[PDB]
Amino acid sequence: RQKFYPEEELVALVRSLDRPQDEGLFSMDVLVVYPHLEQEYTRVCPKRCDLATAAEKAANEAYSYDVNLTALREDIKLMVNNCYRFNGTKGPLANIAERFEAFAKEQIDAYVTKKAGGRRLSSLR
């Protein structure tokens, strides 16, 4: 159980996933914008995440011990799947969710690869 990642970098990584083009789909606090959705939303989606929650988990060291950031990738998957289950698999929002999932995978892959590249350069230990 090594600490692979500084919280400061993982917060920056999560914040980088909030794209203006995605019109707040993953960064909005759903049950703050739409308080009336509490029952229906928690019925269809009994496990929830958003980028604000992911960014707080990053800051709290939730993700820093997973070499492939599995826990963060699972939280992105959950946000995306909740969008599909609640708003459906068809239309402009579902198109954003699928582009967002692909973008998040690329950013996360690029980060894990960069860090591994440097870590493996150590001429100690």
Number of domains in the chain: 1
Method used to obtain the model? X-ray
Dihedral sign for Cα atoms in the order 47, 52, 55, 59: negative
How far is residue 33's CA from residue 31's CA, in Å, rounded to a whole number? 6
Q: Tell me the HSE value of 81 on the side-chain side, using a 13 A CA sphere.
A: 12
DSSP state of 33: H
Closest C-alpha to 4, from 53, 70, 83: 70
DSSP state of 2: -
For 101, the domain range is 1-125
How far is residue 2's CA from residue 24's CA, in Å, rounded to a whole number? 34
The answer to whether 31 and 41 are in contact (CB under 8 A) is yes
The data reach a resolution, in angstroms, of 1.7
- For residue 115, give the CATH number of its domain: 1.20.920.10
Residue labelled with tokens 């496990």? 47
Q: Is 124 exposed, middle or buried (0-12, 13-18, 19+ CB in 10 A)?
A: exposed
